[PDB]
Amino acid sequence: MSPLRRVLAELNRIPSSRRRAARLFEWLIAPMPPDHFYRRLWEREAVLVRRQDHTYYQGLFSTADLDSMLRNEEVQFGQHLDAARYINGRRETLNPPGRALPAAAWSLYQAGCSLRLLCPQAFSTTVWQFLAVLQEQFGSMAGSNVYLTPPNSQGFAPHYDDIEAFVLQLEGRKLWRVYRPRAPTEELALTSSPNFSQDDLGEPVLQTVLEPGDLLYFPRGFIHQAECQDGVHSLHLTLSTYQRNTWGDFLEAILPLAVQAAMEENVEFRRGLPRDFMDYMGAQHSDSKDPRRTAFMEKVRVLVARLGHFAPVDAVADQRAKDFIHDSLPPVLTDRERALSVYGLPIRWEAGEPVNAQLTTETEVHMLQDGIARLVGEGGHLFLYYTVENSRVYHLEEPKCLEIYPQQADAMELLLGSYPEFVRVGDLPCDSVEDQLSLATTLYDKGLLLTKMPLA
Amino acid sequence: MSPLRRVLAELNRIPSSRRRAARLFEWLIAPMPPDHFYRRLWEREAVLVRRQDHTYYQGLFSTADLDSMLRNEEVQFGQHLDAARYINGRRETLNPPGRALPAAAWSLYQAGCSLRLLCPQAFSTTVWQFLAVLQEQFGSMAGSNVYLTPPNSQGFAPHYDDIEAFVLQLEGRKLWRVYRPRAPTEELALTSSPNFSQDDLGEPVLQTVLEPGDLLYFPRGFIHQAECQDGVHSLHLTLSTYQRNTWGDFLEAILPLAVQAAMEENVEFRRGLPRDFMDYMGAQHSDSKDPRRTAFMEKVRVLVARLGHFAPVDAVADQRAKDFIHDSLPPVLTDRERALSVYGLPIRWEAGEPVNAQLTTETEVHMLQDGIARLVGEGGHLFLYYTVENSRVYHLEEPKCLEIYPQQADAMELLLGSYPEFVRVGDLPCDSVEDQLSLATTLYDKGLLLTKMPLA
Amino acid sequence: MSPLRRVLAELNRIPSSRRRAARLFEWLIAPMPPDHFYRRLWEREAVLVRRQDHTYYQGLFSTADLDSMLRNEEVQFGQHLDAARYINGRRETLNPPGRALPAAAWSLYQAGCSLRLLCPQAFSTTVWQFLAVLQEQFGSMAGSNVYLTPPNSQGFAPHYDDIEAFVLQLEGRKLWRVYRPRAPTEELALTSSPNFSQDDLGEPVLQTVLEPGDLLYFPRGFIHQAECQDGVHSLHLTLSTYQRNTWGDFLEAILPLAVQAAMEENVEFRRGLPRDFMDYMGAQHSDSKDPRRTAFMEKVRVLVARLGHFAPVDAVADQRAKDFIHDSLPPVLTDRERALSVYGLPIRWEAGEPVNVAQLTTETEVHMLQDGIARLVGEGGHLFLYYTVENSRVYHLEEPKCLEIYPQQADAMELLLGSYPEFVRVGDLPCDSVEDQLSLATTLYDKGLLLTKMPLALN
Amino acid sequence: MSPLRRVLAELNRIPSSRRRAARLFEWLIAPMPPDHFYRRLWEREAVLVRRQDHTYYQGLFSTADLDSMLRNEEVQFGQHLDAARYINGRRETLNPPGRALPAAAWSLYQAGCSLRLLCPQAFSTTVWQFLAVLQEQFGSMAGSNVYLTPPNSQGFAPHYDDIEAFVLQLEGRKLWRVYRPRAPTEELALTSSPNFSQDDLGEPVLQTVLEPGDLLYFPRGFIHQAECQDGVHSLHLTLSTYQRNTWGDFLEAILPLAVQAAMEENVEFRRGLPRDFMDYMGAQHSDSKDPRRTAFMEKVRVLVARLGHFAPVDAVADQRAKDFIHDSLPPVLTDRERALSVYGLPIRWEAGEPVNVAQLTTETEVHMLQDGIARLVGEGGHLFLYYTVENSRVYHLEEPKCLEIYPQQADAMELLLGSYPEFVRVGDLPCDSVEDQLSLATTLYDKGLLLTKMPLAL
Numbered sequence A, B: 001m002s003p004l005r006r007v008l009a010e011l012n013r014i015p016s017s018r019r020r021a022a023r024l025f026e027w028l029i030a031p032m033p034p035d036h037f038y039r040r041l042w043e044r045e046a047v048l049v050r051r052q053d054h055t056y057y058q059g060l061f062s063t064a065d066l067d068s069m070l071r072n073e074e075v076q077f078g079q080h081l082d083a084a085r086y087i088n089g090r091r092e093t094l095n096p097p098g099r100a101l102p103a104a105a106w107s108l109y110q111a112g113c114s115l116r117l118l119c120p121q122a123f124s125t126t127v128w129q130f131l132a133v134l135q136e137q138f139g140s141m142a143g144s145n146v147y148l149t150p151p152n153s154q155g156f157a158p159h160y161d162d163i164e165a166f167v168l169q170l171e172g173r174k175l176w177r178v179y180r181p182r183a184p185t186e187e188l189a190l191t192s193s194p195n196f197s198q199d200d201l202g203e204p205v206l207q208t209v210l211e212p213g214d215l216l217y218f219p220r221g222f223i224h225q226a227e228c229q230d231g232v233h234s235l236h237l238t239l240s241t242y243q244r245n246t247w248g249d250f251l252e253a254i255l256p257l258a259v260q261a262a263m264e265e266n267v268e269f270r271r272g273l274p275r276d277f278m279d280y281m282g283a284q285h286s287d288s289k290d291p292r293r294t295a296f297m298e299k300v301r302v303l304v305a306r307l308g309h310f311a312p313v314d315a316v317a318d319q320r321a322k323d324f325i326h327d328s329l330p331p332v333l334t335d336r337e338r339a340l341s342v343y344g345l346p347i348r349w350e351a352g353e354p355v356n357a358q359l360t361t362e363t364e365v366h367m368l369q370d371g372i373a374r375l376v377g378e379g380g381h382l383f384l385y386y387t388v389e390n391s392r393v394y395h396l397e398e399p400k401c402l403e404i405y406p407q408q409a410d411a412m413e414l415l416l417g418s419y420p421e422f423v424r425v426g427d428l429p430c431d432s433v434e435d436q437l438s439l440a441t442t443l444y445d446k447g448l449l450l451t452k453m454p455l456a
Numbered sequence C: 001m002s003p004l005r006r007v008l009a010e011l012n013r014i015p016s017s018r019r020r021a022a023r024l025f026e027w028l029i030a031p032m033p034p035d036h037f038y039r040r041l042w043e044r045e046a047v048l049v050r051r052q053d054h055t056y057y058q059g060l061f062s063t064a065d066l067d068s069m070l071r072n073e074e075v076q077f078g079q080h081l082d083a084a085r086y087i088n089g090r091r092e093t094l095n096p097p098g099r100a101l102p103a104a105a106w107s108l109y110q111a112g113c114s115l116r117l118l119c120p121q122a123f124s125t126t127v128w129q130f131l132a133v134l135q136e137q138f139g140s141m142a143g144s145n146v147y148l149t150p151p152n153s154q155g156f157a158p159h160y161d162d163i164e165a166f167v168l169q170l171e172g173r174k175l176w177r178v179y180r181p182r183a184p185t186e187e188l189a190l191t192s193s194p195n196f197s198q199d200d201l202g203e204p205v206l207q208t209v210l211e212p213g214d215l216l217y218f219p220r221g222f223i224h225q226a227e228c229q230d231g232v233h234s235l236h237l238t239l240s241t242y243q244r245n246t247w248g249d250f251l252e253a254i255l256p257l258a259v260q261a262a263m264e265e266n267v268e269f270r271r272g273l274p275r276d277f278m279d280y281m282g283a284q285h286s287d288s289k290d291p292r293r294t295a296f297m298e299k300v301r302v303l304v305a306r307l308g309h310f311a312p313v314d315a316v317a318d319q320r321a322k323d324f325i326h327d328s329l330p331p332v333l334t335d336r337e338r339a340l341s342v343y344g345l346p347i348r349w350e351a352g353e354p355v356n357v358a359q360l361t362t363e364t365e366v367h368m369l370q371d372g373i374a375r376l377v378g379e380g381g382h383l384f385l386y387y388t389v390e391n392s393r394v395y396h397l398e399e400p401k402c403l404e405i406y407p408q409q410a411d412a413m414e415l416l417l418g419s420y421p422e423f424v425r426v427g428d429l430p431c432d433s434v435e436d437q438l439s440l441a442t443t444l445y446d447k448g449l450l451l452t453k454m455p456l457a458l459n
Numbered sequence D: 001m002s003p004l005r006r007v008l009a010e011l012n013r014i015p016s017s018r019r020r021a022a023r024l025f026e027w028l029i030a031p032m033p034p035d036h037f038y039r040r041l042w043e044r045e046a047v048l049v050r051r052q053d054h055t056y057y058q059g060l061f062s063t064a065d066l067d068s069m070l071r072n073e074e075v076q077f078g079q080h081l082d083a084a085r086y087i088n089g090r091r092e093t094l095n096p097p098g099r100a101l102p103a104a105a106w107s108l109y110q111a112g113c114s115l116r117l118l119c120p121q122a123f124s125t126t127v128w129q130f131l132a133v134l135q136e137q138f139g140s141m142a143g144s145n146v147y148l149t150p151p152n153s154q155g156f157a158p159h160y161d162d163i164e165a166f167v168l169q170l171e172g173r174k175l176w177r178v179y180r181p182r183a184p185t186e187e188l189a190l191t192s193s194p195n196f197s198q199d200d201l202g203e204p205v206l207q208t209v210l211e212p213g214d215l216l217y218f219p220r221g222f223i224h225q226a227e228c229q230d231g232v233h234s235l236h237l238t239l240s241t242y243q244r245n246t247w248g249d250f251l252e253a254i255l256p257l258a259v260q261a262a263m264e265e266n267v268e269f270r271r272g273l274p275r276d277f278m279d280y281m282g283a284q285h286s287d288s289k290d291p292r293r294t295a296f297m298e299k300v301r302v303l304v305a306r307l308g309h310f311a312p313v314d315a316v317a318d319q320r321a322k323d324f325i326h327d328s329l330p331p332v333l334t335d336r337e338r339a340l341s342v343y344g345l346p347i348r349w350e351a352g353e354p355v356n357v358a359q360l361t362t363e364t365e366v367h368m369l370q371d372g373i374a375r376l377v378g379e380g381g382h383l384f385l386y387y388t389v390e391n392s393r394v395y396h397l398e399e400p401k402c403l404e405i406y407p408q409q410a411d412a413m414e415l416l417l418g419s420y421p422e423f424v425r426v427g428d429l430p431c432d433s434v435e436d437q438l439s440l441a442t443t444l445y446d447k448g449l450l451l452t453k454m455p456l457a458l
Ligand SMILES: O=C(O)CNC(=O)C(=O)O
Pocket: A114, A147, A149, A154, A155, A156, A161, A165, A167, A225, A226, A227, A238
């Protein structure tokens, strides 16, 4: 077994989804310690991990897998696959319209075009598990792109991305050039950059040839470009996460709610503006030393600083967790998780008819996995959003939730916060035995709960 | 000659529109001094002014004007005129569809229905001038409604408004009851309230019978109601201003831009959120004791406070100023202002053809009026927005502006700031004399500038 | 007094709105008989009427009025006034944004630009009455445009319009050239043409210099162009009507309704298409010799012909009447009509209080205010009376207006509509009772759609 | 083997997709002759075929397939599966929200709920093939629904559909009742009816118990209802076709085009209406004896009849063909078709590069992949070839797909579409240049619309 197949087999043996995610990330950057990586290198500098083992990723994704996909799946150009090339300093996109059959894709490849698969997790169960598990320790959606570049060519123009990137070299070799942010405003850039020319760049802070097994990481804002040497092609998978997951994004959501709450709860935010402020505020008064401006600006600073007191921080955290649920890949269940939940509940047939299975107050249970559900308050109501009905295709499924009544709130929170400890249904903090069985049965039937022993 | 006609005649002799505005407001609340009113009563207390002069408002509006309006104008029910009556603690609306002809209106009036004209200024040139001048010293759109209530009746249920109200008793008398905000949240209310019942009310802070010439002012949020006693009907005009012109409103517009600027200018606002903040933030963690929760809360509060430093106060002031220009009533020119502008340039048919002079570098000029234009910077471009082409009907006319080029900005701002001081064209700060003439000419032709002496 | 002022004064003394319309049109083309005009010249030939009377249109509109309007009204460039110039064979438009003040307009005029007023009826009460009266005999909206061209210039490039035009020369002179439709597809054109060049034209079927008082008429599809002589300016008003009022426009509305009816009422229109018609129908089979192709074609033709039986002709006629009412200018009342309608009913005042209270008795004589102000229309299974009395002089500013007519009143409503201008006594209205009999009459009177033989109150 | 598996094996050996479709329909209603069926029964009468063979449809769809689907596919309630029951004369729908897991579905079934699968063809390759082939001889979309009703119950209230229905009894038995259209307006109804009550129904024209292998056909407008007798459950597949495919539908699209063309080409349609027709036309005037009213009416009928001469029939036929291509299921290729097309072209990856990477020459012999996968359509002064090869098995999931055919290629395209399944040498295509012959053939082959007589990768 290769290291990748080995660790995946190991993951199936780890009862907690939280621990499985920590383990896979540990494996991803080994031998570098995760603690050291997040403390000093995450979002700060480019990092190269020389693996010394070309088989490290064997089983994750290969060119034969790409070929098999184009033939047996409905892979579309533009929607799923891009064909591009960077020749004569110009970025070209040769995307024919329609389905990307093997004959077409490979003809483009033989003509020097690079092929980029936009959603491999939708077509590969191994990439799916890989991302589903890693998204849990990033606390942010984890996507991927697969890049196949033919010998002696470059598929893309230098540029920097709007996400944190992990480059896994799968096949062949490729010369990579990584540059530090060119200016202060480019550090941890908010959006993807345009295509740059060789003249827009300076001296790379990291230039190296990657080999199968190696890993190259760099923060958003770091310009990069890669090319294949003589005779050897290159296949790599880029793992991306942390798209617009900043303090500023958190603030953009909290501010309108904070002002709204301040206006409704405090008369000072309700008082009228001065009748003559238009006489000293405005671009045509920017050079003015009018004492009225200073007082006006001083009031703006004081009111804005107040707003902190009215900021609904928990509500915004829940709104972001809800969007995370919506963006998430559905879970990959271990053999045990499937066997102990409604997914592995057998239906016995006799005489051509199904003959069904009930939880009791003695049944011990806990959440299917740690990152598949979230309690969210909306419009004075409580809703439990979940990922178990999500597609492997990004946003193909709309947000899924079920209403949690006030009486069940305490028990629901207990279940979400005590994973993976088993809890008897009869020990749930509800006002009646009937309420305990009701909540447990609802969660179990929806595939959100597992039992210590199979129900049947 | 009534006091009103007296002051209007007086305003026609005052050179500055700014002085005219201050003079008219002083007149409106005489003998109470403006300084005292704005400093202690405005947005704070209800105020009554026993004029002791039934002729104070003669010339402003009368029942004869209303009657004449229905006859000679296209007054429509719903859009222009409402009919209502308050019987048995229940608000009624008897609005027939279509035009409100005298016969139909007076018929409803006889049935005990009150009549409410929604936009008097569109039909009465005096009310128009009255509101066009006052809007200048309020620094906010000033509107009005005329109420005609038949004897022994009440047209409306008790309620509070979302604007500052000035009630001018025009004919007859009416028993008015004004109440202080019922609760902190209702003080300076953001929106109009629903219809209240006598039970939802306590003791009125002011109960009085108004008579012709009297003035009754009260802040948004003060519930009120009025009724006519046996034997005399009532006609009054309510002047309204300050609709959604609060600090909260200023903040709602400034914050989104502030965070955006903060994220682009300071890397701290671009840093990634913790990978695990969802483990301790959110409704399901409201009682968590994790110290990271407290640190997260404290960080949000400091980031919010710091946003004030990035708030584009001038840009937002210009946007509100631009909206004020759009919402403004067109200017009412004095006899001499008209005689000195393009609106007074003599032109006819002579010899069967147009008679058709031009302005030179020795011509003294200054803005037509003080509150008719505003320079706004949008998308790296100077725009001069104006009110001169506005309709007396609210928003009937779309926003109107004139693009200003860089080499003319200083000259424009100078003209806007030096009102009403005349300035010879040659003294304009411009690159070539062809620009001093170009600018002065364009402004004169649009009806935004006047000359020291008839240019013809 | 000018002929125009003299005919208008006369119209005020003509009680029937239908007869007034006929009289004004008669006056418009005098001495040519209306019967002859419609029977042989309407939609067929260009017609010139040499009035031999320069003061014929005096009072309708002048350059003085145009000046006054720009000075007192909110005239906007593009919206109400256009500034054009046709020089070097090219058509240019110099419409600056914003209000068109006298200073700007006249400056453009002095620069050789022709000025065109798009809606004179909204600003001139005389133009308004003229069009309000003529629309009734055209049975189609009547609009107008005013044109003022400076000496020695041409404001517009040759072209043809999508409406029937009547050119009234008001001031100065102008050389007109009218060409007969170039090709068969241009005869009675449906839409306006682009700007043509002198090269795309042939020989005029009528060339003449119009002078004040003259009338020039030409059908849609006839190309035309005009130029001003030396030292003399030109002012004329073009009366227009019949925009999209063709048999085809009628068909376009009736067809979708006919198929729907045929499909719900006759199973043959509900039967399935052949399973294999795609094998012989379509562009890739235009050369097929399969006999099923000919049979298919004949089948379509017979089914189309058969829709005629399911065509709701009356319903579509009411719908077109409804739209005409929506496009109509509000009526212009005679002294008498006003004096006998709600618009002339006085309100008595006592102690600064209206006490006028005068209802309609069962012995009142009444009839529709005018003959072309209302129309009964059935929709969604109900009856509605659409009217024009609340329309604005500005095209489509006012939305369609109507009041519901209940089944028990239909007969009485059709009686009044079809008996104008004959006075009918309320008590004789075929209603369900005397109550409903008085209800109808009062409602109609209140909306300003009915008049009484004697004023209900003397002012 | 089962009759079904035997006929499907037979179709894999039949060269023409057109013949394959005729053969399968013949099999579907055997022993009844198709000619007789379309001539006297189709859209006219309910038909019962007593097969006397319980294994006739063996292999098409079973309860086990349904169970396997619920467990291995993302079957959603509402979107993919319905759970209903007819109790006390009232129709009930017990569709919970979300995914339809086996546990949830079987519990409802146990509670007396019938289960209906809305798009079997998306989850079963056999049903897909069955419908893809039959749509070709219907000339209209062929859809299907699967109904599983538990013992002793009725799932749906009596009603009639807006499509032609073929009921295929798969497992168990079921008592069916079919009624003749109640009134003239309901004959060949255009839209589905609401739920009816037993009181609205008269006497059945057809009442019988269906057994595995039987076939029950009935036109749109025929009310029907069924229940499971005490004892066994029932599973059936209903094949539907001919939704809004009537002469009236053809007319609706052609009329506006006809008037537009008539007005543009004939002055009579451009002449003005009378200035006073409002005086004698309209509801108020329906009684009027005005002779002008008679003439007006006659002119409308005359102008309407003249419209036929201006009806663009081929243009409307192409638009409907275009919609048919859009609603079609993608083709199911025989082994030979796949092996002779781009789909079966060996270009597999090995040695670290693309191996076995075969071009068409003027010597190559070709013909359309199948007969019902493409259609030439004229739109806005241009020619487009619409095709079905990239359609999803899910209705309308994929947008309309086409490629532009330039005027210089029109003749060659029509030749290929019209000479199927005869082989034509690329060098013999009627084009203006040799390169044009190669260019068209290569483009069509690469899109999966053409096959070659011999594999290109020899
Ligand atoms: O591989 C290349 O040519 C470009 N790759 C990337 O931009 C990436 O992996 O994010």
